Target: cAMP and cAMP-inhibited cGMP 3',5'-cyclic phosphodiesterase 10A
Amino acid sequence: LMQFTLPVRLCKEIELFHFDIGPFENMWPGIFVYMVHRSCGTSCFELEKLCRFIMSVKKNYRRVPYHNWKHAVTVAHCMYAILQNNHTLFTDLERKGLLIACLCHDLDHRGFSNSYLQKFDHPLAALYSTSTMEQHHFSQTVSILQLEGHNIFSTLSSSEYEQVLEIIRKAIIATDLALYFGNRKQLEEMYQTGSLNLNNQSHRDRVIGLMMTACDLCSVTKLWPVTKLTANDIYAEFWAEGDEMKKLGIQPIPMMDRDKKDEVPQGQLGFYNAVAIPCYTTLTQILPPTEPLLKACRDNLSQWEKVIRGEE
Ligand SMILES: CCc1cnc(C)n2nc(CCc3nc(N4CCCC4)nn3C)nc12
Ligand SMILES: [Mg+2]
Ligand SMILES: [Zn+2]
Model:
């Protein structure tokens, strides 16, 4: 049969958590299939259906600075690294579902937060009152799954299919950062009082939720130059939202106000301290082989510290 292969540098470096998928868009589909094949099997999906699914997913990501197709593949690659480093912890349906969930998790994102949609009074905010964009991303996922020749799950039973779509739904909803804080706190408590139990479905769900946050945030776990340049795309979106807030006659939060350009280094610190570090800490506790993510995050926190001290 036809295995996908990668040039030597990619073949080796793709296994590492800090891998960057590179500027050549046309190689991203192949990189994804490669990951599916090794983390799932060459038999997980019909190749022709999978390739058609990938291309429709790509088509449904928009040309925005951060929440775009490169982000989707980047988040899936972080998931691949987690899955490959925790071989025996996950079911076959989870392996299948989670890489798809990652590829799909920001489908049709417009570059605006849930909060902006609510203040704009976008139709999506009436259809979905919480986790607005995330329910939209899951809906887009189902749509694409139902296009002719796009059902990559065709070989699953009605109940297995239902289970995989449920994993995907929950994984996608979990990428709403508003939900992360409470999910991480519960996980922290369960881990510390030793109640955490991976045979408990609602516990697995929470663990997968945290994995999703970890993958979604993985720009903070890259080599410093990647981290730094990604942060520029992040703010390009936020600040455009800031402008749109001012158009509605609302002062945006500092994160989204381009007039606060100078405070960026300090905004990153609070973010690593409040969000990133706690996320990778708890994840490393639950899943020890993901420690390279915490380590990389800590390195990047220290780089933002250097930026503030004027040493960079
Ligand atoms: C998707 C959420 C996300 C993911 N990854 C990264 C690296 N970031 N960085 C941010 C912004 C972090 C931030 N910047 C600021 N401001 C900068 C100047 C004034 C205040 N306040 N805060 C909290 N958000 C994310
Ligand atoms: Mg999102
Ligand atoms: Zn995302």
Observations:
- The chain has 14 helices and no strands.
- The chain has one domain: 1-312.
- Residues 224-247 form the longest helix (24 residues).
